[PDB]
Amino acid sequence: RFEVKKWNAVALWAWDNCAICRNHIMDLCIECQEECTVAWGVCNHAFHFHCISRWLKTRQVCPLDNREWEFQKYGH
Amino acid sequence: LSGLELATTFEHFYQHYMADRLLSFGSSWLEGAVLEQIGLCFPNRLPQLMLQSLSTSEELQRQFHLFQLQRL
Amino acid sequence: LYPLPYLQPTQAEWWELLF
Known part of the structure; x- marks a missing residue:
């Protein structure tokens, strides 16, 4: 016979417009509703530069995934 | 390699070995040190996120213990 | 979190x- 002394198990947390201002993803910015370009970040979300400018000026985390927002500068 | 096109494919390949290495051994000093050297090469910062994931999981273990106590 | 018992x-x- 065998006996278990320890163990480790694994599982995944299985579960798209500009959520922060809720306008359509490709549409314009409600605050100004037309000069906001879209912004991308390392955490792979797309938000309005207006939305993000304000929000970041308030708080310094990604509002969608709880990580320090980093303006994506690859490929640029 | 940083800032070039090859970064994405290198990172894709690196993830695939860092996975098995973390499941075979806990996140040692070695992985964190190598990353503190070559981190800015990885464009999306996936490996750092795997490492941080292990730590978040230990925190969750603490909270689960407390929750059991409250139920009892 | 223990709930507020009161x-x-x-x-x-x-x-x-009656009145």
């Missing part, structure tokens, strides 16, 4: 009727 949960109507 927060969690007619005679006056009757008395009104």
Whole structure:
């Protein structure tokens, strides 16, 4: 016979417009509703530069995934 | 390699070995040190996120213990 | 988180009727 002394198990947390201002993803910015370009970040979300400018000026985390927002500068 | 096109494919390949290495051994000093050297090469910062994931999981273990106590 | 024990949960109507 065998006996278990320890163990480790694994599982995944299985579960798209500009959520922060809720306008359509490709549409314009409600605050100004037309000069906001879209912004991308390392955490792979797309938000309005207006939305993000304000929000970041308030708080310094990604509002969608709880990580320090980093303006994506690859490929640029 | 940083800032070039090859970064994405290198990172894709690196993830695939860092996975098995973390499941075979806990996140040692070695992985964190190598990353503190070559981190800015990885464009999306996936490996750092795997490492941080292990730590978040230990925190969750603490909270689960407390929750059991409250139920009892 | 232990819940607030006091927060969690007619005679006056009757008395009104009697009166």
